[PDB]
Design a protein around this ligand. Structure first.
Ligand code: CL
Ligand code: CL
Ligand code: CL
Ligand code: CL
Ligand code: CL
Ligand code: CL
Ligand code: CL
Ligand code: CL
Ligand code: CL
Ligand code: CL
Ligand code: CL
Ligand code: CL
Ligand code: CL
Ligand code: CL
Ligand code: CL
Ligand code: CL
Ligand code: CL
Ligand code: CL
Ligand code: CL
Ligand code: CL
Ligand code: NA
Ligand code: NA
Ligand code: NA
Ligand code: NA
Ligand code: NA
Ligand code: NA
Ligand code: NA
Ligand code: NA
Ligand code: NA
Ligand code: NA
Lengths: 106, 106
């Protein structure tokens, strides 16, 4: 059963060019949503009625319409230490939207 | 500029097998979210910080991590006429989650 679920994803801030403004941490666990959104669906998928409808339309017209996407449906914050406008390392206690809390088909 | 946006999608309830319980309408405009989530991003995309991070990670590791997905970020209801448990056609005035209101990268 390869369905929509949260899997691990470690993000190094240098690799994505954010080290120019983020002192710490060097890496963090962001997670990612992976898997398909096909029938039969799972319970923790929590699909919208449109995702269900679009998945049905994709089954009968695969070349015209795409299927639903396994995406983050809830995010969690992290803390980052960033240089202030005058170079002062400053804590951003709740840097929102950075880590996956829940996945779902949309 | 092929970015994330709402495009037309007409859904025939018979084609998806929902005519067994939906008398009317026969078809409805559900819309769909289509387009890529790549940089440079648009203003009406409203991307989360994780979608931006994942897109950056996908650029440097295309085979390991996928990119962000253009998905519905707000849905609108429709009205449907459905047969009751005793065959009585009944109006569902606000059948929620059926039509796309806004698209975005997630
Ligand atoms: Cl299965
Ligand atoms: Cl199902
Ligand atoms: Cl929902
Ligand atoms: Cl297919
Ligand atoms: Cl397609
Ligand atoms: Cl969110
Ligand atoms: Cl706290
Ligand atoms: Cl904060
Ligand atoms: Cl923030
Ligand atoms: Cl965010
Ligand atoms: Cl462009
Ligand atoms: Cl951008
Ligand atoms: Cl947001
Ligand atoms: Cl690519
Ligand atoms: Cl992949
Ligand atoms: Cl939604
Ligand atoms: Cl009304
Ligand atoms: Cl209602
Ligand atoms: Cl409803
Ligand atoms: Cl819904
Ligand atoms: Na087709
Ligand atoms: Na997907
Ligand atoms: Na999200
Ligand atoms: Na939170
Ligand atoms: Na958020
Ligand atoms: Na790679
Ligand atoms: Na997409
Ligand atoms: Na949605
Ligand atoms: Na509404
Ligand atoms: Na909804």
């Amino acid at each position: 059963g390869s369905h929509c679920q949260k899997t691990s994803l470690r993000v190094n801030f240098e690799d994505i060019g954010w080290d120019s403004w983020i002192i710490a941490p060097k890496e963090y666990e962001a997670y990612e949503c992976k898997g398909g959104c096909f029938f039969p669906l799972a319970d923790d998928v929590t699909p919208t009625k449109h995702a269900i409808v679009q998945t049905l339309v994709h089954l009968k017209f695969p070349t015209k319409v795409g299927k639903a996407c396994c995406v983050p449906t809830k995010l969690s914050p992290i803390s980052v230490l960033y240089k202030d406008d005058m170079g002062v390392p400053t804590l951003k206690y709740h840097y929102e939207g950075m880590s996956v809390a829940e996945c779902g088909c949309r």
